[PDB]
Amino acid sequence: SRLNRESVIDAALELLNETGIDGLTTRKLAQKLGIEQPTLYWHVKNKRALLDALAVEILARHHDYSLPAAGESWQSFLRNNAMSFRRALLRYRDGAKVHLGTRPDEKQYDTVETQLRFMTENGFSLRDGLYAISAVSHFTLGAVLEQQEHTLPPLLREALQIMDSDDGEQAFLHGLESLIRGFEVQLTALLQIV
Amino acid sequence: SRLNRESVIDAALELLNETGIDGLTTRKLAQKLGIEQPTLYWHVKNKRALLDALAVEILARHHDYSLPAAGESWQSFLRNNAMSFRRALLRYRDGAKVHLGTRPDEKQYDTVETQLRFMTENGFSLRDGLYAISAVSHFTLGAVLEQQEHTLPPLLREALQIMDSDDGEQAFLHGLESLIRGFEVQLTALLQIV
Ligand SMILES: CN(C)[C@@H]1C(O)=C(C#N)C(=O)[C@@]2(O)C(=O)C[C@@H]([C@]3(C)OC(=O)c4c(O)ccc(Cl)c43)C[C@@H]12
Ligand SMILES: CN(C)[C@@H]1C(O)=C(C#N)C(=O)[C@@]2(O)C(=O)C[C@@H]([C@]3(C)OC(=O)c4c(O)ccc(Cl)c43)C[C@@H]12
Ligand SMILES: [Cl-]
Ligand SMILES: [Cl-]
Ligand SMILES: [Cl-]
Ligand SMILES: [Cl-]
């Protein structure tokens, strides 16, 4: 079939949904595209090259809320961006693990830059603004990884039914809010003992 | 060599530090112990059985702060427990990924139970107390996974030097505090609009 970057990646993502990250190989990607292994190598050198490309494309394709709207508060921005990141990671099987394994990308670097400007304009230092964006990312990554992996005593028994009744979204959205408020309390305090 | 559970796991953890999770196989575990593959199978049926056992032992061995001290506040407990969890996950190469892949364990279930009682005594519902413990865990897991994987424009350039100067600990400890305060603000509010 056709072997430009876009088609290769469409085929690799679709293969990702069939096999998961551990299962995904170039040899099976070559089968799906109706081509021999050495043809594929011209286009994609190894699994690691494939996964880096996949990590960037999952976000380009689906991480739709990467930038603040006109007028938007920093709280609201961190919320919408976390929700969008989460959703993009959930869209493909082992999506979170595909993301974790990769350093960020020339275009992802101008987006995070704009975010860091945004947070500085709203009164964060570079430091505290970086800590805020990192905490959000790490919390989200961790929640999604746990959700994607999974799928007694009393209190637990009831506990692990309120966590199962849902796919993890409620637990995530509540913790998101706790995190944002915690940042707000940090920020608002300036140099007072908080 | 000697093949009781303790020695097998000591050898598997030491092998873990040489190869990482993707590299670790029963066949290499058998080599390290000076035994043939079918001897090992009697003791450990597969990689998945090995990893589940490893996940439980990393925590038994090193997650020293699993329970509150006499008198301790819930804030302080969540802090010390997060720090302890983080440290135990960092102690072995791919430690976080070994943990993520496993459901919890008969003894881990009585510990989380005691935690959930602890949070209820200090005024959390089961729900909100579960959300708090989960958020802490997910944040910590995500921070550690990112730290273990890793090892331009201006603001970033300065950003990714304050994140590198350290191993991730400062970013983690700051976000930890933001999370705990966020919970405190939730809890204290009761039914008022917060
Ligand atoms: C979820 N958002 C908060 C961010 C985002 O919109 C991204 C996009 N597109 C990311 O890559 C993110 O989701 C993301 O995972 C990266 C993350 C960040 C701060 O940017 C970095 O350059 C960087 C780094 O070099 C090491 C660790 C971390 Cl947390 C980062 C920025 C994230
Ligand atoms: C870091 N601590 C906060 C906890 C802890 O002390 C543990 C131990 N030992 C865990 O297993 C923890 O670190 C941990 O990872 C588990 C986690 C929890 C709530 O307990 C569960 O039974 C459970 C579950 O079934 C699904 C998701 C989650 Cl987050 C959980 C409890 C964690
Ligand atoms: Cl074609
Ligand atoms: Cl072509
Ligand atoms: Cl011996
Ligand atoms: Cl023996």
Swiss-Prot record, chains A, B:
Upregulation: By the [Mg-tetracycline]+ complex.
InterPro entries found in the cross-reference section: DNA-bd_HTH_TetR-type_CS, Homeodomain-like_sf, HTH-type_TetR-like_transc_reg, HTH_TetR, Repressor_TetR_C, Tet_transcr_reg_TetR, Tet_transcr_reg_TetR-rel_C_sf
Keyword Metal-binding: yes
Domain of life: Bacteria
Keywords: Antibiotic resistance, DNA-binding, Magnesium, Metal-binding, Plasmid, Repressor, Transcription, Transcription regulation
Ligand binding (tetracycline): H63, N81
Gene Ontology terms for molecular function: DNA-binding transcription factor activity; metal ion binding; transcription cis-regulatory region binding
Binding site for Mg(2+): H99
GO biological process: negative regulation of DNA-templated transcription; response to antibiotic
Quaternary structure and interacting proteins, as annotated: Homodimer.
Record PANTHER family: HTH-TYPE TRANSCRIPTIONAL REGULATOR RUTR, TRANSCRIPTIONAL REGULATORY PROTEIN
Protein name as catalogued: Tetracycline repressor protein class D
Taxonomic lineage: Bacteria, Pseudomonadati, Pseudomonadota, Gammaproteobacteria, Enterobacterales
Gene responsible for this protein: tetR
